[PDB]
Structure formats: C-alpha cells, structure tokens
C-alpha cells in the first residue's frame, strides 16, 4: 500500500516472528516444573506476546519486509492513531505544563521575594495554577489577543 508496505495481518514474516518468539518462550518454559511461579511468569509472557501481536495485526498497521509495524506519519487521517492523535495528546499535555509554569512564574514574580518562591514553592498557589491549565489553548488565545503574552522592548539586548 502506502510506500510499498503491506498490512501486518497479511505479512507472513510477522507471523514468523510471532511463532519464533512463542517457540523460544515455550522452550524456556520446558525447563521449569509444574505450576511453579517461573512457569506462571513464562505463560503470562506467552499470553502477552500473543495479545500484542494480535492487536498489532488488527490495528491498520503497515509492515515492511522485516515484519515490523511501520508508522505512516505523512499526515493522512487513515493512519491517524500512529502519530496525529498522540501528537495532539502531547501538545495538550506539554502546553498544560508550560502554561502552568509560566503562570506560576508571572504570579510569584509580583511578590516581595520572587526568588524565594522558586526554591520553596507556594504549594497552595501552585495547585491553584496547575489545575487551571486545562484551558491553556483558550487562555493562550485570550492573552495573545490582549497583548499580555509577548514583551516588546523592555527585553535586554547585547551591545551589537
């Protein structure tokens, strides 16, 4: 399909990889005894390996000639769960972190001892700001509009 890849559900090398891993795990399982915790752990390993391979097969995942899932990150929504949705999730979380950090910096920057409140965090104010970051996309595009997001010329510059 895309880039010459093929779905992993029809990739023979993918099933060969699964079979080889299961065979190695079973051979390891053979050298232990009865329902002893080592055998239980190896059986859990086998079950998890089978579940992971089955989930990857039924996941709209494209496999190359090596039988490994390749990620299609050109931007198409068909393979949108590989990069685009995790990209949105990370952008949300990281914007949350950056927004709460910036808000805390600007909030304790207007107190008597701004530097003290950076090594000794005001946990009440920190908790107040941190749970308010869920609106960071909206807060950012409400502070940029008001001109409160960017400094203009009070920023320092070197000699040249």
């Amino acid at each position: 399909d895309i880039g010459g890849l093929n779905p992993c559900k029809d990739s023979e090398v993918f099933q060969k990889r699964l079979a080889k891993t299961v065979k190695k795990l079973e051979n390891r399982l053979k050298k232990y005894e009865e329902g002893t915790p080592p055998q239980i752990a190896i059986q859990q390993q086998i079950t998890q390996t089978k579940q992971r391979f089955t989930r990857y097969a039924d996941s709209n995942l494209l496999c190359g000639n090596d039988g490994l899932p390749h990620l299609i990150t050109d931007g198409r929504w068909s393979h949108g769960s590989e990069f685009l949705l995790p990209s949105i999730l990370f952008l949300y979380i990281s914007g949350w972190i950056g927004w709460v950090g910036r808000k805390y910096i600007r909030t304790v920057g207007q107190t008597s001892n701004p530097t003290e409140k950076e090594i000794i965090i005001d946990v009440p104010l920190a908790i107040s700001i941190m749970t308010s970051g869920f609106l960071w996309p909206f807060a950012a595009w409400q502070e940029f509009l008001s001109g409160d997001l960017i400094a203009s010329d009070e920023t320092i510059t070197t000699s040249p």
Partner: protein
C-alpha cells in the same frame, strides 16, 4: 554538667529545614542566580566554613559518621532481606557448583521480565556477583529465616545509629578534649573494635561456622543440620566433628594449646571440597589477630601512668637530614580533620586494593573461587574503591595544606622541609614518570610496529628479546618452598598462585600457579608508570597548594578556585583541586589498566576447566602470553574478542548489560562537552535563551547562569568516571557471566 559532653547544644527543630543554605554565611541570604543552587550542595559538608570552632566541626563530623553508619546498616539489612525473600539461596546451598546466585527478581513491566535469568534452582532473577551467598555459607547461615533475622537486626542497628547521631548532636555533644584524646581513641579502636571484633568473630566461627560448614562439606543437607544454638548447648554435636571440645576450656587455661589443633590449624592452600580457605585456618587467624590487636591496644597513655605519649614519640624522631623531625606533627593531626582524612583515606584505599588482591589470590569463602563473576566483580570493585579513596586522601592532604597548615607551628619540621625542596621531588618524579612511560609504553609500541612490519623476532616477547621478571619468579619460588623450610608448621603454600597443584572444584579451576613471563613484566611496569604519574599529579597538587613561582600567594585563593587569570601566559587549573581532578583522570586510567590486566590474565592463564585426565583448558586459551604484548593485541584479542558477549546480549537475559554498555558510552561522551568547552560560550547561549524567555514573559526570577568553571570541571570528571567505569562494568559482567 559532664566534663566530656555538652547537654542540649542544638534544639531539635524543623525551622532550619525550611531555610536552605542556613549553614553558610553567603548562601543564607537566599538565591539570586542558579549558581546558589549548586553552591548549596557543594558546601553542605564543608563544615570548616560553616563554623569557626573546631568543636562544632568535630561534633558535626561525629553525627555525620553516625548517619553514614546508619546508611550502611540499612544497605546491609536490604541485602539480607533480599537474600531472605527474593533469592534462591536455599537452592544454591544444595547445589553450589551448578546454581548461579541470584537475589533480585525483576517486576514484569514494559517487557523487562527478560532480565529474570535462568539462574537455576527453579528460580528466575538477576545473577548476583557480590558473593553474598558464599559469605552467608561461610557464616554458617543455612536457612532464609536467619537471613530475615539478620535483616531485622540490620534495620534495628540502622535506627540505633540514626538515634545515636541525633543524640550526639542535639542532646549530648562531646567536647573538643574528648575528640582530641587520640591516645584513648587509638587504644580503643585497636583493642576493643579490632581485637574484640576479631575475637568475637573467632568465637562465632569456632562455635557456629566451623561445625555447620564441616557438616555441609560432608554432604549433610541444610535441613538435617542442627540449628546453630544447639552447637553451643550441646558439647557433643561439635565434639564429633572436632574431637577436642571434649576437654573443654581446660587446655586453654592450662596453656596446653596443642590440644586445640583439631579446629585451630595452620594448613594453607585451599579446601579441596569448596575451593576456599580452611575455616579452621580462618578461625585460628582471627584468634591470633584478636590477641595481637588487643596487645597493640595497650600502647598509648590515656588515663594512668602507663603507656606512650604520641607527642613524645614523634618529637624524639629527629635526624641529621630532617632537622626538627616529627616535631609538631602531633599538633597537626590533633587540630586538623583534613590531615587525618588524608592519611586515613590513603591507607584505606591502599588497604582496599590489598584486600582485592588477597581475595582472589586466596579465596576465603566456600565455592567462591569457581564463581568467576563474583571473583572478577569483587576484585574490580575493591580496586576501584581503593583508587577513589587514595585520590581522596591526596585531595584532603591538599585541603589541609591550603587551610589548616600553620607555617609558624611547623618551623623546620618534616612538612616544612618537604615544601622547601618540593622542586627536587617533583622534578625527579617527572623524570621517573617519563622514564617509566617511555619504557613500558614504547616497548609496547615497538612490539606493535615490529609485528606490523613482519619482524616477529624483534619483539619484546618470550620467543624474542625476553624480559623475564626474575625477581618476582624468585619470590614465587620462595613461597612454594616455604612449607617445611621457612614455614615448617605449614602443610601447603599460602596461595597456589605462587606455585603448586591445580585446584579444581567440580571440574572448574579454583586456583592455579600464575606464571609470570615477559607479558607480565610489561604490564607490571605499565602499572608502576601509571601509579607514578598519578602520584606526580597529586603530590604536585599537595606541595604547590600554598605557593609557587607562578602564584606566590596561591594559598590566599583557597583550595578550590578555577585560575588566577589569563596572565602569566595563562594560569588555568593551578589550584590544588584541579590536581585532584587530573589525578582522578589518571587514577581512572591506572585502575582500568589494572583491572584489564587482571581480567585477561585470569581468563587466559588461571580460570577454565580441568579434564578428568588432568588437561587444563582455559577460558581464552593462553593468548595472554603472546598477544598482550602489543596494543593491537589488547584491542583485538581482549577488547574486541571479549566484547562479543556484550554486543550479542540483546534479546537475552544479559540485555541490560548491553543497554548499560551503550548508556555508559553515551555518558562518557557526554562528559567531553563539559571537559572540552568553556563557561563563556554557555553563558552567552543562555543569554539568547533568556532573551526568548523574556520575550515570552517566562524568564525565571532566579537568573540562570552557566555552571562555574570548577563545577564544569567537576561535572566533566564525574561523567567521565561514571561512563568509563560503567562501560567496563557492563563489559566485565556480561563477558564473565556468559562464559
């Protein structure tokens, strides 16, 4: 109102916990730049600059020692708890030669359960190379319940040491005169601590370890072995194994000590069953050590008209060549903690290296000589600790010279006379270092270039120009002839390394005569050269710590400073700290070469398997003799060859070793950013980053500053040491566990 302690000196309060940097006069005002954060941790234990009173520094040091001992006790309790709960110690007891010791199981997350190896005995976990199983077996511990109780005792002891530290800083802190009783302290540490510890351990060995281990070697399973207390309440369970307890303590008090030859032997060699030292020999050794140390503890005058005064001993040791001699040394060592730390750390690291040597040379634990990973790990770890401690001793000698050295109090004594001719010492040490390096390494390079040019008869090899270590071979011959000639009451040599028979346990070689040829000559001279260069750097740091021809007032700049400026052609790294930094680098080099020599020589010419007919086949096959004489040989037949197990560990239970190999390479390369660069570039880059932050109104109030020059060097050396030592750690462990 005791005469030794002050009651309730410091109030137990949490107020100062909420004021970081309260100890320092400069850091107490609060952070203004990020340099304050780093200065906070760099001055935490520098008690000299926190108080102007030696008494307060001594009390802080005493409580810090208690905290450290509590940490050590907690670590030991954790080790015993892991042995009790997450180990295959019981399975290893019944099959020491076929079960690999494991005492740490790994949770099944993110696929990391592959690290749980097939250590044997129906167990999965990480193979343990600390030799705790062999130590516990030598202690007579035959059950995991005993390990649990030892862990509980360790936890109780750790809490006790924590309470002792709190008590002796906040409730009853000793006075300076108590700390300065070096005669009493030496008497107690020599008699009580050392001698009575040896005596108590000899008692434990004789009454618990001797019978239990004898029964274990006889084939008695641990379940039918009597509980250790039964060997004390019943004089018949121990009198069957050693038929001399039937006479009781009467032979001891009647001076008929020959009766106790059953369990106080002098045999030498190794136990043929376990491959370790005879535990009867060990008990006799500890008894003799106890008596010697108790006797040695009655030397210094403490509270009666009896004993020696160290001041009178030192002041009487003058000479024509040494002026006032040792006059003033007693005042130096009773008023400066740094001098005591220097001496103790240097001798402590040297002792650690000696311990490392004597460990593999004469394996003291049952079934530890045939556990090659344990032997390699123990040697390498102890040599590394020794090198670090020696560098620390040099560092604190330099610190004493900078800070606690008084010129007036040391007029024409040994310290003064050493400083007065420091040039001669350093110049001759420089010449010796150049001579040794030229010779050792250039003989290596000559061998390499002769081999590369197809001239095999021009090498410094055994089948070529030969440099036989005749002096060491003479000593080896003297030791193998000692039993019956110079040690007439010995039955076997102290170690089979000096010569004798091949000692094998379960077809695995425990010890064997270590032949010394031209390959050992070159590597020994390499060791001497590296040690001499490290000594050169550290001694130049100590002697030139106060002044020099460059900076006549270097003592006024302190122990730790980056430079005096770009003038005089450049005055980088003139400190004494910058000498403990370079000396750390050279100690890493020396110890790395030492452990490489040990690993290759043991794998190639000691360790291996013995055929039923007596044919010895080694791990590598004797390639050390002919291929360790060229740098290409070290690169190929040792590094490239034995790195195969590390690089091929992916997908196996040793994959963590490959991951740590790669990560240690990454950290070592990361160090070079700090070692090669300078502070100005990073400060000017932080300037633009701060511009961006200010543009987005997110510049922190604590102004971000690049790490200071000294801190940049410290970070570089710490990362370099961590990366190199971790790379060697992963390489050694994967190689010696795979094969």
């Amino acid at each position: 109102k005791s005469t030794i302690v002050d009651f309730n000196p410091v109030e137990t309060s949490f107020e100062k916990w909420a004021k970081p940097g309260q100890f320092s006069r400069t850091l107490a005002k609060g952070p203004k730049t990020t340099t304050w954060i780093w200065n906070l941790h760099a001055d935490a234990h520098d008690f000299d600059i926190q108080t102007n009173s030696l008494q307060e520094v001594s009390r802080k040091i005493f409580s810090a020692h208690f905290g450290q001992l509590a940490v050590i006790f907690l670590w030991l309790s954790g080790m015993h708890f892991h042995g009790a709960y997450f180990s295959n110690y019981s399975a290893w007891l019944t099959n020491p030669t076929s079960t690999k010791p494991s005492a740490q199981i790994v949770w099944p997350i993110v696929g990391q359960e592959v690290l749980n190896a097939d250590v044997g005995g129906n167990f999965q976990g990480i193979q343990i190379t600390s030799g705790f199983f062999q130590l516990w077996r030598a202690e007579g511990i035959t059950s995991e319940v005993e390990l649990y109780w030892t862990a509980v005792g360790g936890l109780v002891a750790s809490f006790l040491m924590l309470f002792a530290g709190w008590f002796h800083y906040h409730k009853a802190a000793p006075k300076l005169e108590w700390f300065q009783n070096v005669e009493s302290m030496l008497n107690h540490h020599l008699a009580g601590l050392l001698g009575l510890g040896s005596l108590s351990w000899a008692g434990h060995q004789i009454h618990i370890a001797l019978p239990i281990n004898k029964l274990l070697d006889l084939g008695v399973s641990p379940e039918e072995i009597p509980l250790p207390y039964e060997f004390i309440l019943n004089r018949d369970l121990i009198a069957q194994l050693y038929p001399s307890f039937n006479k009781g303590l009467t032979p001891f008090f009647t001076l008929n000590w020959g009766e106790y030859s059953d369990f106080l032997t002098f045999k030498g060699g190794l136990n043929p069953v376990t491959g370790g030292l005879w535990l009867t020999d060990t008990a006799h050794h500890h008894l003799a050590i106890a008596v010697l140390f108790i006797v040695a503890g009655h030397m210094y005058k403490t509270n009666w008209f009896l004993g020696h005064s160290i001041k009178t001993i030192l002041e009487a040791h003058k000479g024509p060549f040494t002026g006032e001699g040792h006059k003033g040394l007693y005042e130096v060592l009773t008023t400066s903690w740094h001098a005591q730390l220097a001496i103790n750390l240097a001798l402590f690291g040297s002792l650690s290296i000696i311990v490392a040597h004597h460990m593999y040379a004469m394996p003291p634990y049952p079934y530890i000589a045939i556990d090659y990973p344990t032997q390699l790990s123990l040697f390498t770890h102890h040599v590394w600790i020794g090198g670090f401690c020696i560098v620390g001793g040099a560092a604190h000698g330099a610190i004493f010279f900078v800070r606690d050295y008084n010129a007036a109090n040391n007029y024409n004594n040994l310290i003064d006379r050493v400083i007065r001719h420091r040039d001669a010492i350093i110049s001759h040490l420089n010449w010796v270092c150049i001579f040794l390096g030229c010779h050792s390494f250039g003989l290596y390079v000559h061998n390499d270039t002769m081999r590369a040019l197809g001239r095999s008869q021009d090498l410094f090899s055994d089948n070529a120009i030969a440099l036989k270590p005749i002096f060491a071979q003479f000593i080896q011959n003297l030791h193998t002839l000692a039993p019956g000639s110079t040690a007439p009451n010995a039955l076997t040599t102290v170690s089979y390394a000096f010569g004798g028979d091949v000692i094998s346990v379960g077809s695995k070689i425990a010890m064997m005569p270590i032949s010394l040829g031209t390959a050992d000559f070159l590597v020994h001279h390499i060791h001497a050269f590296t040690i001499h260069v490290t000594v050169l750097i550290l001694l130049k740091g100590v002697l030139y710590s106060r002044n020099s021809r460059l900076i006549p007032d270097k003592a006024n700049l302190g122990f730790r400073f980056p430079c005096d400026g770009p003038g005089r052609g450049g005055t980088c790294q003139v400190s004494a700290w910058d000498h403990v930094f370079l000396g750390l680098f050279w100690m890493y080099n020396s110890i790395s070469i030492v452990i490489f020599h040990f690993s290759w020589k043991m794998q190639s010419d000691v360790w291996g398997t013995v055929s039923p007919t007596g044919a010895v086949s080694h791990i590598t096959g004797g390639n050390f003799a002919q291929s360790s004489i060229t740098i290409n040989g070290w690169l190929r037949d040792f590094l490239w060859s034995q790195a195969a197990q590390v690089v091929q560990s992916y997908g196996s239970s040793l994959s963590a070793y490959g991951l740590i190999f790669l990560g240690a390479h990454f950290i070592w390369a990361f160090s070079l950013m700090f070692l090669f660069s300078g502070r100005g570039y990073w400060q000017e880059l932080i300037e633009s980053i701060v511009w961006a932050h200010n543009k987005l109104k997110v510049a922190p109030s604590i102004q971000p500053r690049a790490l200071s020059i000294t801190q940049g060097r410290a970070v570089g050396v710490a990362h370099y040491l961590l990366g190199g030592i971790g790379t060697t750690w992963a390489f050694f462990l994967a190689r010696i566990i795979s094969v």
